[PDB]
Design a protein around this nucleic acid. Sequence first.
DNA 1: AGGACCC
DNA 2: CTGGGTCCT
Length: 376
Amino acid sequence: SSRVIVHVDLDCFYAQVEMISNPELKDKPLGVQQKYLVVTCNYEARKLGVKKLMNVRDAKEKCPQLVLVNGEDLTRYREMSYKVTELLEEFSPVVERLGFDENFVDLTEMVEKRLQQLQSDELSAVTVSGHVYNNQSINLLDVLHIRLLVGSQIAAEMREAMYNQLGLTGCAGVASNKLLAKLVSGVFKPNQQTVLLPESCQHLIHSLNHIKEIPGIGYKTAKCLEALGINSVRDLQTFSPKILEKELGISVAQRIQKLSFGEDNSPVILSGPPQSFSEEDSFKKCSSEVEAKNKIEELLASLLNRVCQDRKPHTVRLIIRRYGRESRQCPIPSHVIQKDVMTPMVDILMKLFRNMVNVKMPFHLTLLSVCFCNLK
DNA sequence: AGGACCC
DNA sequence: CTGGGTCCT
Ligand SMILES: Nc1ncnc2c1ncn2[C@H]1C[C@H](O)[C@@H](COP(=O)(O)OP(=O)(O)OP(=O)(O)O)O1
Ligand SMILES: [Ca+2]
Ligand SMILES: [Ca+2]
Ligand SMILES: [Ca+2]
C-alpha cells in the first residue's frame, strides 16, 4: 500500500566530477562545454548569471572569467554515475536510474525493518534529518509521519556515504511516491534534503507554475495542453477527462491527470545494467560518404571499447539527423558476436547508411550515432 | 522505425 | 554543431 520513496539528485553533476579530478578548479567559476554550449556549470559560475544549455557566447559575455572544460566525452561521468547507483544499491537493491545523475530508491521495506527494531519508548525519539517541506508540523503518533522521518534518516545516510566514499554531494527528497520525491528533492539545493508530509502534498503540486513542470509532461504534451487552454496544475486537475482522453489518448490523459493531483503509483524499477549503449557526435555539416564513413569508424571504435563490459549485443542501430531523427538497425551476425571486428561492422553500418541517404544526391547530416542494443 | 518521455 | 538514456505503438 503506502510507500517511502527517495529521489537522489547530484549537484551540478559534470561540473562536480570535473572538480574532483583537479580540486584546483574548486572555488573557480566553472562551465562544462560540449561543442558550442555550456551544458552545466558549478554554483560559483551559476551565481554570475550563467546557466545550463546557454551558449558560450551568452556565457562568456557575463563571465569573461568563466572557466571552460570539455565534457563531450561522457566516459568519466558515466563511470561515476554507475558508482553512485551501486552505492545506493547497497542500501536497498531496488534502484531506478533516471539519466546519469538521478536515482529513485524504494525505502519501504527498509523503513519497516528499522521501525520493528525499535521499542515503544524509542518511537517518541524519532527525529527528521534535513528540511520538512513547507515547515510542516510533525506528528509522532502519525505512523505515516514516522515512516517518512525514518526515510529522511536513511536519505541522510545515503548522502553521507556518497560524500565520504565518492566525494559527491547531492540533494534528496523523501515522499510517498516517485513524482513527489522528485518534486520535493529540489526544494532546497544544493546539497540539502527535504521530506514531504502528506498534508503538504497539495501545496507542493500547486507551487508549480506551469504543467510543463510536471515530470512526465514534455514538449509535445505541454504544447497540446496549452492549445486547450490548460496552463496551471489546477486547470489540468479540473479539466474534462473525456475531452482530455480524446485529444491525447486514454493512456496519457488518465496518467497525467492523476499526476496533476500528485498521484503516481508507478513502481520503482530495478534499472540494473543498461539496455543499450551508444556513441554519438554532431556537427555543422556532413555531405560525403567518406566523411560519414570516417565518423562512423570513430564512433564504432569507441563503442567497441565499451562492448566488453558486463553480455553481448545482437543488434546494431545507426541514427542520423538532417537539415526528428532517422534510423536503421539490423541483427549482428553471430560469428561477429563471437568475439578484427571493425571491418564487417563498418560494412554493415555503411549499408545501413546507404539505406537512408543516397550517395549520388545532395545531403546534409548534422548527427551520427551508433547504438548497440538487444544485449544478452 | 518512430513516437513520447528523462537527464 | 550537445550526449546520452528509457519504454510504447
Ligand atoms: N535538453 C535537455 N533538457 C534537460 N537536460 C538536458 C538536456 N540536454 C542535456 N541535458 C542534461 C545534460 C546534463 O547532464 C544535465 C544538465 O543539468 P541537470 O541534469 O538538469 O542537473 P545538474 O546536475 O547539471 O545541476 P543541478 O541538478 O544541481 O541543477 O541535463
Ligand atoms: Ca535533476
Ligand atoms: Ca542534478
Ligand atoms: Ca516535465
